[PDB]
Amino acid sequence: QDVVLGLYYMTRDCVNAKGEGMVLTGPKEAERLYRSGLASLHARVKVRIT
Amino acid sequence: GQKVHPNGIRLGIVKPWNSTWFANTKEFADNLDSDFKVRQYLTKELAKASVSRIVIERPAKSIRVTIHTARPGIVIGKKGEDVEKLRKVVADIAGVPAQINIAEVRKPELDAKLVADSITSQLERRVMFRRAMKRAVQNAMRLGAKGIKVEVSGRLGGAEIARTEWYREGRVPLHTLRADIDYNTSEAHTTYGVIGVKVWIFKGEILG
Amino acid sequence: TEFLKPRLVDIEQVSSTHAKVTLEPLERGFGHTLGNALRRILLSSMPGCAVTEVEIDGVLHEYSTKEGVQEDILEILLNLKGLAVRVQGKDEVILTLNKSGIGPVTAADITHDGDVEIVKPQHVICHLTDENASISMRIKVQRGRGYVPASTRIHSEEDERPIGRLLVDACYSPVERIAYNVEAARVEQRTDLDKLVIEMETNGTIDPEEAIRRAATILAEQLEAFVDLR
Amino acid sequence: TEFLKPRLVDIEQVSSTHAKVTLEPLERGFGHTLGNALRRILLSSMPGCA
Amino acid sequence: ATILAEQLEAFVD
Amino acid sequence: EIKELLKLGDLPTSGQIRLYDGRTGEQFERPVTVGYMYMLKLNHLVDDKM
Amino acid sequence: PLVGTGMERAVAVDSGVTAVAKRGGVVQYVDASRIVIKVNEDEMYPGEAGIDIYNLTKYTRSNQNTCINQMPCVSLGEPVERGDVLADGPSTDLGELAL
Amino acid sequence: GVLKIVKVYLAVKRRIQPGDKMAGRHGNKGVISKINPIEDMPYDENGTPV
Amino acid sequence: PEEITADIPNVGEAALSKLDESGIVYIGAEVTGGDILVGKVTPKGSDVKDSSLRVPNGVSGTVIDVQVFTRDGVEKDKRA
Amino acid sequence: RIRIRLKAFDHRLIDQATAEIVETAKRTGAQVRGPIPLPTRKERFTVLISPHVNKDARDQYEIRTHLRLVDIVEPTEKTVDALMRLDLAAGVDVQISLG
């Protein structure tokens, strides 16, 4: 119950947030942009995943 | 009378004093007398209660007694009923405001005086002295004494010719000043005469 | 490395207890780091003196009642647990409270020594109603940190104490509430600097610059394990 | 009023660009203090060039 | 660690 | 009347205050509900069951 | 309870765990042992001059091993009326009901 | 009949601990899980922990 | 009959403690589990035993009250 | 000026007392003179240790009374009074004397 709420709030999206439509060189700097305070947890973004 | 008193030789180093006050030559003797009185009274009273050490300490015209006993419950009785009673009598004896504290003696088998007392009691109620001695020694050892010695003397088993017998176990260094040697004595007033019981209990060496 | 260093520039006392303090200047982003670290340390690990053992005369246990008073003995122990003492020299002192007569027993009636300071002269303890009633308690004030309770202090105590001494729980920490704010600093040539406005709320016994200095030393000596060894 | 200093017990070097600094023991509620302080400094304040 | 220690180096004992 | 009483006190009308985290010092997104509930201790204590 | 229903008063009075005053008046408040209430003259009988002495039940065993205890919630020299409460029982606060 | 009749009344004082049961008035049962420190609590911007 | 005496057997200077010289817990105290409250043991039951009602396992507390309407005789030489 | 004469049998205890006194002085007032050690009195005693007769058999005891002279140069309002509530450890006879 708690963990599906944490995931459903995490992997979602909104039509404008901090860092809308910026491009990221990996998931590591995705978490670094979430922690430093430069993007939001749900902000649509092109990443490069492997 | 060969040996030095083990407490007495160590008062400056590892053992402390019982009466702990300052007084000028004027009031000192009187103070001593008072101490003697109060202590005597306490012994008389708390015979059935296992009492090891009465520590008197008088600051500012007011006497602070500290009774070290194995069972506080019998000395205290009901909470602040017996202690209170004791206090006023102590005060009377002294002629000043009294204050009784009661320290609880952890491990009465390792306290020497208590052991001695027990032995004396046993002797009085007509047990085999030797068996009592053994018990005393064994118990202490079990409890974690680095060593113990006990000695009993005179009219043993009501025999006409008096003698002394003693049991040591572990190590009991008396010449070593830094050794915590709890020494104490007692006297069994039996039907055949007095039987004196000495007991040395070596807790361990102090390093400073 | 173009960093700077902060200083305690202005220390305003809003009252004797509630008192703010600035910090200036902090670098960019450091404000929430130092503020949260000083908050955690200043709430967990400060030394303050508190009541530990209470000794009332003519008492058996803490669940009895007494002659001539309002609050019962558990109420007296709670009102003594709230006390705020500030010793200077020793680390373990014994106070004395003696009072007779009809009226409330404030904290200002304790016969103080020289190096103890009771900073709440309106802290009520008892409400003596009979004029023939008396109360003579002897408090014991240790000094530590954190929270050490009666159950753990039931066997921890080594010094064989006599029976009749009521054991009160020890709330040692004199900090109760702390908030920090990261404003915009007014630097005449820099715009990317900030100030930290720590808003403490003490027990009255602790001096805020001394508390901040001690928390800073705690943090630096904790980080020395990272600095020196690897 | 004396505090527990730790010993740095482990550097499990997984690769040349990987580490895991196992570190014990600290006072109750100090691991989060040290970890969060180091994490925010390492994210948004450590100097370097790119 | 030395960045934070030199940052806090001012008001210590 | 709950909203009007929350306006007499200086509290926010929604009943919800923004709360920071004691661990990380940073704001919880999406403000949370804080209030006073009258909580009771039932007599099913754990050191009568262990 | 900050959010109650107002039925706390009737439950805390009507269950006999609080020492509700029988006859109104003032107070003498020895109280260490008992609340002593001087009675106003209108509620007071001609003979049997009379002042009401309430017994407070201190720390004792309930049927569920909890502690039933009464504490006086009136001071010394304070007017009380008939039906008013004097001693707060277990789980009561000034005559209300504090579970 | 009965000869020696000694009744002794102990009084334990139980505090609260991980494992007790608390509940509100609405049916919200709970077993109190973690007894947190004051610092780790969610504090609002005024400073008071919850 | 069984007996109310502190002169508790086999068990040593760990019986006579939270009690008086004539037996029974001495009131108040910080008693826990495995303590002794009322020395209550008989001879012929080198054939003595320990029925002395003790404190149950896991509980602590303070003796708040001791009631005794015992077999007309409970007294020692005089508390009764 | 307040001269203070500390006297005791235990030296460590005396030292402790002296320090405490200094502390008491120094917070309230200013310019405490200092803890000056005077000569110790070594009052000796010889006694015969036999119950009856053996004269060369002897114990030689002594009582070492230590002296500490603490002086306070400026008696303020706050300072002098501070000692009233501030009693020292037992077995240490103090002797304050202003002027």
UniProtKB/Swiss-Prot annotation, chain B:
InterPro entries cross-referenced by the UniProt entry: KH_dom (IPR004087), KH_dom-like_a/b (IPR015946), KH_dom_type_2 (IPR004044), KH_sf_prok-type (IPR009019), Ribosomal_S3_C_sf (IPR036419), Ribosomal_uS3_bac-typ (IPR005704), Ribosomal_uS3_C (IPR001351), Ribosomal_uS3_CS (IPR018280)
SUPFAM superfamilies given in the database record: Prokaryotic type KH domain (KH-domain type II), Ribosomal protein S3 C-terminal domain
UniProt-listed Pfam families: KH_2 (PF07650), Ribosomal_S3_C (PF00189)
Keyword field contains Signal: no
Domain spans labelled KH type-2: 38-106
Cellular-component GO terms for this entry: cytosolic small ribosomal subunit
One MF term in the entry's GO annotations: mRNA binding
CDD domains: KH-II_30S_S3 (cd02412)
Assembly with partners or alone: Part of the 30S ribosomal subunit. Forms a tight complex with proteins S10 and S14.
NCBIfam families: rpsC_bact
Protein name, UniProt field: Small ribosomal subunit protein uS3
Native species: Escherichia coli O45:K1 (strain S88 / ExPEC)
Gene of this entry: rpsC
